[PDB]
Curated annotation (Swiss-Prot):
Stated role: Receptor for both mineralocorticoids (MC) such as aldosterone and glucocorticoids (GC) such as corticosterone or cortisol. Binds to mineralocorticoid response elements (MRE) and transactivates target genes. The effect of MC is to increase ion and water transport and thus raise extracellular fluid volume and blood pressure and lower potassium levels.
Effect of residue 44 to E: Loss of coactivator binding
Region entry Important for coactivator binding, spans: 41-44
The protein, known as: Mineralocorticoid receptor
Species of provenance: Homo sapiens (Human)
Known partners and oligomeric status: Heteromultimeric cytoplasmic complex with HSP90, HSP70, and FKBP4, in the absence of ligand. After ligand binding, it translocates to the nucleus and binds to DNA as a homodimer and as a heterodimer with NR3C1. May interact with HSD11B2 in the absence of ligand. Binds the coactivators NCOA1, NCOA2, TIF1 and NRIP1.
Recorded consequence of changing residue 35 to R: In PHA1A; reduces aldosterone binding
Similarity comment: Belongs to the nuclear hormone receptor family. NR3 subfamily.
Full-protein interval shown: 737 to 982 of 984
Length: 233
């Protein structure tokens, strides 16, 4: 039973341990590193995904960590603030002022825009959950994965699970359209993230060992079009 397993393994609260732009960004990076810990424990108990060679699991996670965390940022903003603010952590909610101080003001707007989508679609917890798994399987290597045959079977099943959900019948295509749009939002998130990373030493913006670990060997798997985003439309 996919749905029941998905809600149970869903990670829980996590403090960021909370003011210039550099300190604000350093904080979110540390919070990111702490959230990626919950993402790793969550994925390892994920149906299907946990049976693919460990190499595919790690790769998929590195291609999609930004998706998963920002998408969650939305669920959280949706649930705790009716999408009115950015709920990164309990001790750190963002409003236009904050979004401004992080030197991240447009990027914030885009995420807040996803949240707004949630309240408008009246997104469901059951939908959210399956959708977060699909985001995990939203980007693959340009020429395919090791166990590609297995990958597609699993991905098709979760797509089927989302279908079982919505069955008005159009809501399906609405949620999968929303999923494709996430790609656009995350591609901008990463470009800015890749830049701050490259200048971290000069900008005084702290990045956790984990994020450094991921972003580092992610760039090579992306550059020269070595990555392939999967869309529904
Ligand atoms: C400083 C920086 O480049 C920013 C740009 C987009 C930002 C990320 C946006 C998505 C996100 C949501 C969270 O709830 C935790 C922190 C993260 C993972 C953010 C950490 C800081 C990033 C990587």
């Amino acid at each position: 039973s996919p749905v029941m397993v998905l809600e149970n393994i869903e990670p829980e609260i996590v403090y960021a341990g909370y003011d210039t732009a550099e300190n604000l960004l350093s904080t979110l990076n540390r919070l990111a590193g702490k959230q990626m810990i919950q993402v790793v424990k969550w994925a390892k108990v994920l149906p299907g995904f946990k049976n693919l060679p460990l190499e595919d699991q790690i790769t998929l996670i590195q291609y999609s960590w930004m998706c998963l965390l920002s998408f969650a940022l939305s669920w959280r903003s949706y649930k705790h603030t009716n999408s009115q603010f950015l709920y990164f952590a309990p001790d750190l909610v963002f409003n236009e002022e904050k979004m401004h101080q992080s030197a991240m003001y447009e990027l914030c707007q885009g995420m807040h825009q996803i949240s707004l989508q949630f309240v408008r679609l009246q997104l469901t917890f059951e939908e959210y959950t399956i959708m977060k798994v699909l985001l995990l399987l939203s980007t693959i290597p340009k020429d395919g994965l090791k166990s590609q045959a297995a990958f597609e079977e699993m991905r098709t099943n979760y797509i089927k699970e989302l279908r079982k959900m919505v069955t008005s019948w159009q809501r399906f295509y609405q949620l999968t359209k929303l999923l494709d749009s996430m790609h656009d939002l995350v591609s901008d998130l990463l470009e800015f993230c890749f830049y701050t990373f490259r200048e971290s030493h000069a900008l005084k913006v702290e990045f956790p060992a984990m994020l450094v670990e991921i972003i580092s060997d992610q760039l090579p798997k992306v550059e020269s079009g070595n990555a392939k985003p999967l869309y529904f439309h």
